[PDB]
Amino acid sequence: FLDGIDKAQEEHEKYHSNWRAMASDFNLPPVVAKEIVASCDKCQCSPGIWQLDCTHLEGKVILVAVHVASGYIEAEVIPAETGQETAYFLLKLAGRWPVKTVHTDNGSNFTSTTVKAACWWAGIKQEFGIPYNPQSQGVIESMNKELKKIIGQVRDQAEHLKTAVQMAVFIHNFKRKGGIGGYSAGERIVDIIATDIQTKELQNFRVYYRDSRDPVWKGPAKLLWKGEGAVVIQDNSDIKVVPRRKAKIIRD
Amino acid sequence: FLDGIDKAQEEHEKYHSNWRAMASDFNLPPVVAKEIVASCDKCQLCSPGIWQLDCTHLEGKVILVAVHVASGYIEAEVIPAETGQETAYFLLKLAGRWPVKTVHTDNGSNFTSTTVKAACWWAGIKQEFGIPYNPQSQGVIESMNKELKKIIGQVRDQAEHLKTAVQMAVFIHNFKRKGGIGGYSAGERIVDIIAQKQITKIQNFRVYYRDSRDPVWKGPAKLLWKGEGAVVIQDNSDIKVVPRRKAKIIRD
């Protein structure tokens, strides 16, 4: 495993990624894997949802996007805060992935005409203001701070801070694997989108829910699932989880 | 006649069928079709996955014929010789076109040949020799043999070699002769008859866990059921429900 040890050490010389990742390069139990971090001086929901934000590191404007469900990053140093350039970058996000809804604030950096045209052409919905759960915004701001610490480290390696911003984007996409089972943002992204296509396909049995309180039976309800203790059904826009011994079964 | 009726007459001269096409597809009145068939000298007027096979001779040439019980969709090809090896090759060619599961023969020496058994194995085709155990196909196999012989009796004027005339007759009997229940050509009916996939579509569907608070936690769920206004997904050791607005579904 000396080759694996050398490879993991080089990886930390380049990436300083999570020790959970480096356990893979070591191909060794965690006890040694902690040593690379210990010795390291700088160390020791719908798939179509995205959010856009901004930060002002070192007097420059950095606009960052995150896929909420997986900790993915898409970022670019923007020359100016004008809505025209944000429109171009939102065009990029929309082209590269099937993005359905975007959560930003009400500011003119997003309510400008160009952004509205971008959403109109690409087919994206946007929210303007405070989301119902600003803890997600707090999480992405914490991610912004972690990217900033990352930058405070990488800037030893990049002559231009913009390039270090990109370097961080990639480090967090792939090298910094963690959470659940130590997975990179790329892995979660890919798993989520494959799940999404299989769920489009998933989206011959109908049920007459037997409302014994009348007593009466409901009409041609659909069977969204036949669990073990209950049988979900949908009735127009309402989804009523019926009792498993009080649901008729019609085979179509 | 109308351009459509003239085209139908030319299609008759091409395909030796009058009533089965223009009376049904071309909406010709029955009187005109009856007059045409009167003038036409060439117009003398179970367990899906179950096929027959048989051997026939004509003008010193051997023809192996594959039939379908469930709609009378007939495949055929001229054989160089009655030997078993050619029969095995033809049955091979059969296997890849439709999910053949069990065939019945006439216990002939060329069919009891070992190589036939070998092909039936490595393809996965079962042999049920003797006569079929359903009192419809027993005379139906010979009736469709007679039908093919009669079709060739008219086709032969447009082919000097049987090797092409046989395919001509096969196309006629597969599509240009439409009848039976509502006037469905054998090919159509077999489309219908052939029509685990849906289970395997959703086997690896994991879900980004959220809840009614609309969070960005995106826990490592497994999709259990979809529909009726929400989802049913397991959360580690427990079970909950989430509206469709959240709980993004991805492949594992």
Place this chain on the structure above:
Amino acid sequence: FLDGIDKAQEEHEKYHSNWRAMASDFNLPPVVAKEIVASCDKCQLPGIWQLDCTHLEGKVILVAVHVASGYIEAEVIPAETGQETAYFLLKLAGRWPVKTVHTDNGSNFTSTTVKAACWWAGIKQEFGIPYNPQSQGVIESMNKELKKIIGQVRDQAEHLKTAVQMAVFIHNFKRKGGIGGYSAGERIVDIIATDIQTKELQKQITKINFRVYYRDSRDPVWKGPAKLLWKGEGAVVIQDNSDIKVVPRRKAKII
């Protein structure tokens, strides 16, 4: 058109694609999509099949593929003459309802026999480079994968032709994959049943044909034919060259 079809047309104006979306996602009948691409100045462009050849181990192998599902029909051909390709194309035409075929301009397809085969069976053929040779690249990649398959199966078959057939079947049924791990057979059957239902849907769509001849208003002359739009008791609405008119049924004739 329907709100869905109007939305599809607006999405075309937004995205400059007609057939790839409304024919597949919006379940539009192929005739309407063809009419739209014909009218679409920005669109220069189940019955589609392609035929090709390969020269594995010094022998000629001619392979057909159904574009929409990854199906295979192949046979080791004794020679490259158009006579035998005519016989095999006869086989393809008999076995499935094949409407159009995409090959090259070579004499292996422009020979007289192939033209007679298309004439008898009712098949159209393209000769040359298709507008999207990436499909040809895909089928060539499939040819290479069949060749790797052969490099493996030839441990099992005494005659390479038989291994060619074995591969045909393996890819038809056993090698299920894509979308939800489906065999070429499953996709083929789904597509053709959907095609039957779309013929029925096209019939019911075109129902709502009718030539209407009518006496115009104050005009002694009868005109027509106009397209019928709506038929009440006593009156009809008619389309006479993009000019909607309302005519009492006493002054109209519906054929």
Place this chain on the structure above:
Amino acid sequence: FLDGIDKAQEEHEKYHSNWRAMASDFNLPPVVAKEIVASCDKCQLSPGIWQLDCTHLEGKVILVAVHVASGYIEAEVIPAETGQETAYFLLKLAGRWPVKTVHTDNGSNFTSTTVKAACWWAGIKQEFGIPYNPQSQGVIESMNKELKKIIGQVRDQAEHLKTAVQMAVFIHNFKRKGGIGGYSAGERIELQKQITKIQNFRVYYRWKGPAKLLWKGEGAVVIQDNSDIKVVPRRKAKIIRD
């Protein structure tokens, strides 16, 4: 799963299909599924393969990234043909997909050192010349022509190429669905960790020599000794870590 194991092994005796398929017959995690290919004599043998190229249009330079395995095309307008911009674009590529090896046209702007530097610190390999598979060789130019044709219609709705290029890219990524069954390029576009976790254990069974451990189920312990796979009950063997 012994029935599943036998079925997958027979399938390889007949088909030698992808181990990804055989994971289904096994109905088991990938660690065992790799073994059928590993033991297969005709087996035990490129997604992550992208092209890059430079194009010009109306006096503007456009760098285009393609994917061989589905024709999913990325692109962006470049301020100038210099190498540094190319390195920045390739950087931006690295973080979106696990790019592993790219091929170029040996141009001076691509043979520039900074391109090599970026390919290193990201971990991207360069295979210059022309691709060694006779599909992408004409496919790269065919998709270049496709992008040019798409722009030929897009241009009426964008006065600057910098936006028209992204318009064409979104069209070619999703709004053009075709190929096998009509799948848009975007749609078309753990086991090793388990293998690495267990490959440091040695098993002594019945005592016989050391064996490579493969699985540690609930009722058995599958091993591999002398290039042969033997199932033993759990109590009949001892597992130690080396």
Place this chain on the structure above:
Amino acid sequence: FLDGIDKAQEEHEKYHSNWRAMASDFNLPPVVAKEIVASCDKCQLKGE
């Protein structure tokens, strides 16, 4: 009737004879003669 259909059409492009005239002259089933009239644009001159 194949012979008579071609003749009745030629006579109809001159005379526009109604369907009974074509059926009597060219020995036609009433449905065929009616189809000849029906597909004439110059013979559609009466409402219901």
Place this chain on the structure above:
Amino acid sequence: GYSAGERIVDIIATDIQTKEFRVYYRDSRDPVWKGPAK
């Protein structure tokens, strides 16, 4: 043809059915909330 008694039955039932809090409208477009709306 309703005698006064029946009509008054009807009127008083209508009356009881007709017998049968301030809000901050949350303008998320800003996002912002409105004042003491009634």
